[PDB]
Write an enzyme that holds these catalytic residues in place. Structure first.
Site, PDB file in Angstrom:
ATOM      1  N   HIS A  22       0.824  -1.298  -0.055  1.00  0.00           N
ATOM      2  CA  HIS A  22      -0.017   0.337  -0.265  1.00  0.00           C
ATOM      3  C   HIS A  22       1.065   1.017   0.005  1.00  0.00           C
ATOM      4  O   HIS A  22       0.942   1.974   0.748  1.00  0.00           O
ATOM      5  CB  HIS A  22      -0.735   0.464   1.128  1.00  0.00           C
ATOM      6  CG  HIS A  22      -2.404  -1.179   0.912  1.00  0.00           C
ATOM      7  ND1 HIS A  22      -2.121  -1.340   2.247  1.00  0.00           N
ATOM      8  CD2 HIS A  22      -2.601  -1.637   0.302  1.00  0.00           C
ATOM      9  CE1 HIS A  22      -3.768  -2.571   1.865  1.00  0.00           C
ATOM     10  NE2 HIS A  22      -3.466  -2.940   0.876  1.00  0.00           N
ATOM     11  N   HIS A  78     -12.111 -10.725  -4.982  1.00  0.00           N
ATOM     12  CA  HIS A  78     -11.283  -9.546  -4.183  1.00  0.00           C
ATOM     13  C   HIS A  78     -10.535  -9.519  -5.690  1.00  0.00           C
ATOM     14  O   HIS A  78      -9.410  -9.821  -5.698  1.00  0.00           O
ATOM     15  CB  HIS A  78     -11.030  -9.641  -2.879  1.00  0.00           C
ATOM     16  CG  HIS A  78      -9.973  -8.883  -2.249  1.00  0.00           C
ATOM     17  ND1 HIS A  78     -10.459  -7.492  -2.101  1.00  0.00           N
ATOM     18  CD2 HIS A  78      -8.234  -8.385  -1.837  1.00  0.00           C
ATOM     19  CE1 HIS A  78      -9.837  -6.107  -2.068  1.00  0.00           C
ATOM     20  NE2 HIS A  78      -8.367  -6.986  -2.034  1.00  0.00           N
ATOM     21  N   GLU A  80      -8.504  -6.461  -5.981  1.00  0.00           N
ATOM     22  CA  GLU A  80      -6.510  -5.758  -4.893  1.00  0.00           C
ATOM     23  C   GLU A  80      -5.600  -6.623  -6.313  1.00  0.00           C
ATOM     24  O   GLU A  80      -5.852  -7.573  -6.412  1.00  0.00           O
ATOM     25  CB  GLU A  80      -5.968  -5.872  -3.917  1.00  0.00           C
ATOM     26  CG  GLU A  80      -5.523  -4.727  -3.472  1.00  0.00           C
ATOM     27  CD  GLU A  80      -4.943  -4.614  -2.590  1.00  0.00           C
ATOM     28  OE1 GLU A  80      -6.375  -4.891  -1.505  1.00  0.00           O
ATOM     29  OE2 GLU A  80      -4.585  -3.479  -1.603  1.00  0.00           O
ATOM     30  N   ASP A  82      -2.699  -7.586  -5.453  1.00  0.00           N
ATOM     31  CA  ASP A  82      -2.260  -8.131  -5.362  1.00  0.00           C
ATOM     32  C   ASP A  82      -2.857  -9.571  -5.382  1.00  0.00           C
ATOM     33  O   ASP A  82      -1.704 -10.607  -4.801  1.00  0.00           O
ATOM     34  CB  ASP A  82      -1.458  -8.326  -4.001  1.00  0.00           C
ATOM     35  CG  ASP A  82      -2.377  -8.288  -2.748  1.00  0.00           C
ATOM     36  OD1 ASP A  82      -3.567  -7.227  -3.089  1.00  0.00           O
ATOM     37  OD2 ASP A  82      -2.928  -8.153  -2.053  1.00  0.00           O
ATOM     38  N   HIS A 146     -11.789  -7.061   3.557  1.00  0.00           N
ATOM     39  CA  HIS A 146     -11.721  -5.053   3.465  1.00  0.00           C
ATOM     40  C   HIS A 146     -12.453  -4.323   2.095  1.00  0.00           C
ATOM     41  O   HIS A 146     -12.234  -3.142   2.260  1.00  0.00           O
ATOM     42  CB  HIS A 146     -10.444  -5.614   3.847  1.00  0.00           C
ATOM     43  CG  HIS A 146      -9.616  -4.951   2.628  1.00  0.00           C
ATOM     44  ND1 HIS A 146      -8.741  -4.020   2.348  1.00  0.00           N
ATOM     45  CD2 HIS A 146      -8.932  -6.189   1.961  1.00  0.00           C
ATOM     46  CE1 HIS A 146      -7.699  -4.467   1.063  1.00  0.00           C
ATOM     47  NE2 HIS A 146      -7.604  -5.864   1.186  1.00  0.00           N
ATOM     48  N   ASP A 165      -7.664 -12.208   1.490  1.00  0.00           N
ATOM     49  CA  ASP A 165      -7.236 -11.971   2.694  1.00  0.00           C
ATOM     50  C   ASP A 165      -7.798 -11.958   4.225  1.00  0.00           C
ATOM     51  O   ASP A 165      -6.799 -11.881   4.938  1.00  0.00           O
ATOM     52  CB  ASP A 165      -7.473 -10.143   2.868  1.00  0.00           C
ATOM     53  CG  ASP A 165      -7.179  -9.322   1.289  1.00  0.00           C
ATOM     54  OD1 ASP A 165      -5.801  -9.833   0.715  1.00  0.00           O
ATOM     55  OD2 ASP A 165      -7.107  -8.402   0.666  1.00  0.00           O
ATOM     56  N   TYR A 193      -1.099  -7.035  10.984  1.00  0.00           N
ATOM     57  CA  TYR A 193      -1.991  -7.751   9.769  1.00  0.00           C
ATOM     58  C   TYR A 193      -3.174  -6.830  10.138  1.00  0.00           C
ATOM     59  O   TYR A 193      -4.043  -5.637   9.781  1.00  0.00           O
ATOM     60  CB  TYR A 193      -2.304  -8.726   9.358  1.00  0.00           C
ATOM     61  CG  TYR A 193      -2.902  -9.156   7.869  1.00  0.00           C
ATOM     62  CD1 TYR A 193      -4.800  -8.712   7.910  1.00  0.00           C
ATOM     63  CD2 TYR A 193      -2.063  -9.300   7.126  1.00  0.00           C
ATOM     64  CE1 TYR A 193      -4.867  -8.934   6.759  1.00  0.00           C
ATOM     65  CE2 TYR A 193      -2.988  -9.331   5.568  1.00  0.00           C
ATOM     66  CZ  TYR A 193      -4.789  -9.305   5.561  1.00  0.00           C
ATOM     67  OH  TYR A 193      -4.780  -9.508   4.727  1.00  0.00           O
ATOM     68  N   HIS A 226      -2.994 -14.827   1.685  1.00  0.00           N
ATOM     69  CA  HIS A 226      -1.432 -14.731   2.118  1.00  0.00           C
ATOM     70  C   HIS A 226      -1.145 -15.371   3.400  1.00  0.00           C
ATOM     71  O   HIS A 226      -1.160 -16.059   4.121  1.00  0.00           O
ATOM     72  CB  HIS A 226      -1.580 -13.186   2.624  1.00  0.00           C
ATOM     73  CG  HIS A 226      -1.671 -11.825   1.736  1.00  0.00           C
ATOM     74  ND1 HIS A 226      -1.040 -11.463   0.713  1.00  0.00           N
ATOM     75  CD2 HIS A 226      -2.828 -10.958   1.059  1.00  0.00           C
ATOM     76  CE1 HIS A 226      -1.621 -10.622   0.130  1.00  0.00           C
ATOM     77  NE2 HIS A 226      -2.562 -10.239   0.783  1.00  0.00           N
TER      78      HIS A 226
HETATM   79  C1  LIG Z   1      -6.508   0.083   2.823  1.00  0.00           C
HETATM   80  C2  LIG Z   1      -6.735   0.802   1.102  1.00  0.00           C
HETATM   81  C3  LIG Z   1      -8.099   1.877   1.682  1.00  0.00           C
HETATM   82  C4  LIG Z   1      -8.718   2.420   1.154  1.00  0.00           C
HETATM   83  N1  LIG Z   1     -10.103   2.892   1.145  1.00  0.00           N
HETATM   84  C5  LIG Z   1     -10.777   3.343   0.501  1.00  0.00           C
HETATM   85  C6  LIG Z   1     -11.950   4.594   0.880  1.00  0.00           C
HETATM   86  O1  LIG Z   1     -11.465   5.033   1.852  1.00  0.00           O
HETATM   87  N2  LIG Z   1     -12.594   5.101  -0.245  1.00  0.00           N
HETATM   88  C7  LIG Z   1     -13.117   4.390  -1.408  1.00  0.00           C
HETATM   89  O2  LIG Z   1     -13.328   4.888  -2.377  1.00  0.00           O
HETATM   90  N3  LIG Z   1     -11.776   3.740  -1.850  1.00  0.00           N
HETATM   91  C8  LIG Z   1     -11.103   3.468  -0.426  1.00  0.00           C
HETATM   92  N4  LIG Z   1      -9.856   2.416  -1.361  1.00  0.00           N
HETATM   93  C9  LIG Z   1      -9.267   2.302  -2.712  1.00  0.00           C
HETATM   94  C10 LIG Z   1      -8.199   3.302  -3.022  1.00  0.00           C
HETATM   95  O3  LIG Z   1      -8.590   4.552  -2.766  1.00  0.00           O
HETATM   96  C11 LIG Z   1      -8.679   2.950  -4.477  1.00  0.00           C
HETATM   97  O4  LIG Z   1      -7.596   1.400  -4.933  1.00  0.00           O
HETATM   98  C12 LIG Z   1      -7.360   3.845  -5.235  1.00  0.00           C
HETATM   99  O5  LIG Z   1      -7.740   3.811  -6.945  1.00  0.00           O
HETATM  100  C13 LIG Z   1      -5.509   4.034  -5.002  1.00  0.00           C
HETATM  101  O6  LIG Z   1      -5.334   4.762  -5.663  1.00  0.00           O
HETATM  102  P1  LIG Z   1      -3.402   4.680  -5.494  1.00  0.00           P
HETATM  103  O7  LIG Z   1      -3.310   3.686  -6.430  1.00  0.00           O
HETATM  104  O8  LIG Z   1      -3.224   6.629  -5.894  1.00  0.00           O
HETATM  105  O9  LIG Z   1      -3.419   4.693  -4.009  1.00  0.00           O
HETATM  106  C14 LIG Z   1      -8.557   1.783  -0.230  1.00  0.00           C
HETATM  107  C15 LIG Z   1      -7.986   1.280  -0.653  1.00  0.00           C
HETATM  108  C16 LIG Z   1      -6.426   0.660   0.139  1.00  0.00           C
HETATM  109  C17 LIG Z   1      -5.891  -0.397  -0.137  1.00  0.00           C
HETATM  110 FE   LIG Z   2      -6.960  -6.574  -0.281  1.00  0.00          FE
HETATM  111 FE   LIG Z   3      -4.359  -8.867  -0.222  1.00  0.00          FE
HETATM  112  O   LIG Z   4      -5.595  -7.707  -1.723  1.00  0.00           O
END
Ligand SMILES: Cc1cc2nc3c(=O)[nH]c(=O)nc-3n(C[C@H](O)[C@H](O)[C@H](O)COP(=O)(O)O)c2cc1C
Ligand SMILES: [Fe+3]
Ligand SMILES: [Fe+3]
Ligand SMILES: [O]
Ligand SMILES: Cc1cc2nc3c(=O)[nH]c(=O)nc-3n(C[C@H](O)[C@H](O)[C@H](O)COP(=O)(O)O)c2cc1C
Ligand SMILES: [Cl-]
Ligand SMILES: [Cl-]
Ligand SMILES: [Cl-]
Ligand SMILES: [Cl-]
Ligand SMILES: [Fe+3]
Ligand SMILES: [Fe+3]
Ligand SMILES: [O]
Lengths: 399, 399
Positions: A22, A78, A80, A82, A146, A165, A193, A226
């Site tokens: 992250h 999920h 993400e 990863d 999450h 996750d 974590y 993970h």
């Molecule tokens: C730990 C974490 C928390 C996040 N919390 C929010 C959130 O509260 N609201 C939202 O709209 N997106 C949330 N996201 C999604 C990110 O904003 C989204 O993946 C964004 O495109 C990431 O931009 P970046 O690559 O510049 O960090 C979260 C992502 C992560 C990994």
């Molecule tokens: Fe994740």
């Molecule tokens: Fe993950």
């Molecule tokens: O993830």
């Protein structure tokens, strides 16, 4: 590949080198791994992929395990990067292959891969997918555990819960199973974590676990995305999460600060001495935020009944690393914890009050602040120590 | 020791190793030095000491230059520990020695050293102290340049202004004089210094310089408390400060962000391309705050007509390093600069609006924000580029 159980094959990726997750918000000091699983019954199912950085390796390794065309279904728990990171590379080879995922996952997969032409199949909690030999997949939606797209996949017969996750940890080891790795390191990574990623979603944890249990389905293994597969007493991690979700705290106080000329540091050390001599039960930790692992600080906060946070005044505001940490804590939603702000100032000050307000807004129950001017002399250090004593008395747990 | 001019002897300390000032808030990548001066006329005057870490060395070196008992007066321009740090050690040897300083310096010296029994002598602007051979010291109060206790000391005849922190820079060299060191490195350190420490006090700079000039006193040398003695065309640094104090900006835009999965980074790079192709005059710099020198980012902000600041949304707040940087900028008081917030989000977002408001509160004049969902595709990147073009057009300087 490694055999998980019967026809379940681990086809993931170990990552010994990774140190930053992250951005740099989560330091993986013991590396990580990305678990993907290939289930081979009458139908062949791939569960998740791996991090985008390993996309070529993933597809290559997968080919070694099975002809890509023989894969019947792809489950994405999920999206993400990863876990869904290798999906573009894979889908380039088998573009017609059905993908099973939550409605929200269509948005997130498309949001990362921009192939909306892929054959998505929306699943809801309780939906099933037959794979032959008397077994089927059962899907369980887990929004905001999450991400909005998150779900888990349960395999009947084998009684394996693919939890993505949830219940995982960033801990790289060549051994796949929980009984095969170092237990203290395993625990430490599990807790770091939860504390740093899952704390803000704690309110969702117990209902979702309750729902899954209410299905009255056997769980012989929990295969996360993970770290280790929980095969030996798998419910141990489930019970830990139930403990951790309940606004968890130990008889522990964490003190952390930043400082320009060591004055707030002197205050911190005195406060700790006062605590220590007043209530020996309390585990106390002190961290200079400029010189410490941020994630370790937060794990300690997670484990703590209360915190003391220090800053001097710098250009009429607080020190930036403290402001940053308070922002992050606001997002993490620590609950049922107490706090006290402290620090030094040169003339008009103001940063301590500024900090105390933001801690309150972050959800901490505030005790009185402690202020000192310039460098604490003997008398001032006495006051700091007494503050520690008074805080220890106020936050004392029942005998 | 090194002869500065006539009977003025440099008796300070070079610090090649130091990398962290004010905690870790100011990175001294070229080290620093602490200038102290011994004036030997009919009276012997010590001007400032050195950093506390070198207190034993200071007193030892001073003994080598002169019997401590022969020191008649001690002038303390500024009581921060990098200048008054050795004072306790020294005063232990000559406890009766008069100390000359501002009223505020009594509070700060006592605040650090806790020897209120020392013989303090309050000086006000225009007060004098005779030292024989037709020469005297003239004191000039300079409150909040950069502390309440700050002053400068002017030596008549020799026409030397001991300016303490003002006009100094953190730049370690064995050569004492400005004409003897690398000019680009000298300039770079001067500007980094002003940008990161003195910007919030800019409103005080031009009146104080005006006042000093109004004395119609010759300035042949400016002997600061950090770095070189300005002996060759000393007013060059005075003129730079007058330029720098006037809400300084160049035709320059700085873009900085943090990012968890590179989406906001992609937005940043596209914005820069849009700027570059629209207005070639503009110097553009981009920084990932998690991967860059914070002080270099701020020097660039200081030099910039406008900035773009990026964050994704993380647990409904902004990324912590961005919150920290915005806190610090709030304290630094950048003036007459424009800004635009940008970033990606996964679902409900919010961090970009959050950021834009705080930038406005920090004194930036806000242009429209730029938002994208997840990873920008081709179309979204076009929008980011166009945002760059539009920003470049809005902030364009006259032909
Ligand atoms: C730990 C974490 C928390 C996040 N919390 C929010 C959130 O509260 N609201 C939202 O709209 N997106 C949330 N996201 C999604 C990110 O904003 C989204 O993946 C964004 O495109 C990431 O931009 P970046 O690559 O510049 O960090 C979260 C992502 C992560 C990994
Ligand atoms: Fe994740
Ligand atoms: Fe993950
Ligand atoms: O993830
Ligand atoms: C760069 C800088 C900015 C400061 N700004 C303020 C201020 O705005 N108000 C104030 O009362 N003191 C200010 N001070 C004085 C410090 O708060 C004072 O030195 C305090 O005792 C330092 O505590 P610490 O050693 O824990 O950082 C400032 C000091 C520095 C070095
Ligand atoms: Cl930890
Ligand atoms: Cl305060
Ligand atoms: Cl710089
Ligand atoms: Cl947003
Ligand atoms: Fe200073
Ligand atoms: Fe200084
Ligand atoms: O200083």
């Amino acid at each position: 590949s490694i055999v998980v159980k019967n026809n379940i094959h681990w086809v993931g990726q170990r990552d010994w080198e990774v140190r930053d997750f992250h951005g740099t918000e989560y330091k993986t000091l013991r590396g990580s791994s990305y678990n993907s699983y290939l289930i081979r019954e009458e139908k062949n199912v791939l569960i998740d992929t791996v991090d985008h950085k390993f996309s070529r390796e993933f597809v290559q390794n997968l080919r070694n395990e099975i002809d890509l065309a023989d894969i019947d279904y792809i489950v994405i728990n999920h999206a993400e990067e990863d876990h869904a990171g290798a999906l573009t590379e894979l889908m380039a080879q088998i573009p017609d292959t059905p993908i099973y995922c939550t409605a929200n996952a269509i948005d997130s997969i498309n949001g990362h891969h921009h192939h909306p032409e892929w054959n998505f199949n929306v699943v809801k909690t309780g939906d099933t997918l037959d794979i032959g030999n008397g077994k089927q997949l059962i899907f369980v939606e887990t929004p905001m555990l999450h991400w909005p797209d998150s779900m888990m996949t349960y395999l009947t017969g084998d009684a394996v819960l693919f939890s993505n996750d949830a219940f995982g940890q960033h801990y790289c080891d060549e051994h796949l199973f929980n009984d095969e790795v170092d237990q203290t390191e395993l625990f430490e990574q599990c807790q770091r974590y939860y504390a740093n990623i899952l704390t803000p979603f704690s309110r969702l944890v117990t209902p979702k676990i309750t729902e899954i249990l209410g299905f009255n389905l056997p769980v012989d293994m929990i295969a996360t995305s993970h770290g280790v597969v929980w095969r030996d007493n798998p419910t141990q991690i489930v019970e830990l999460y139930l403990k951790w979700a309940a606004d968890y705290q130990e008889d522990r106080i964490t003190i952390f600060y930043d400082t320009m000329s060591n004055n707030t540091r002197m205050m911190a050390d005195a406060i700790a001495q006062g605590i220590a001599e007043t209530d020996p039960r309390v585990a106390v930790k002190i961290f200079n935020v400029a010189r410490s692992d941020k994630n370790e600080i937060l794990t300690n906060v997670f484990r703590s009944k209360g915190v003391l946070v220090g800053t001097s005044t710098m250009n009429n505001v607080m020190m930036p690393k403290i402001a940053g940490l308070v922002e992050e804590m606001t997002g993490l939603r620590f609950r049922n914890k107490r706090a006290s702000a402290f620090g030094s100032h040169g003339w008009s000050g103001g940063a301590v009050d500024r900090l105390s307000t933001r801690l309150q807004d972050a959800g901490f129950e505030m005790s009185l602040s402690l202020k000192a001017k310039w460098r604490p002399d003997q008398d001032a250090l006495k006051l700091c120590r007494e503050h520690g004593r008074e805080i220890a008395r106020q936050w004392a747990l029942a005998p």
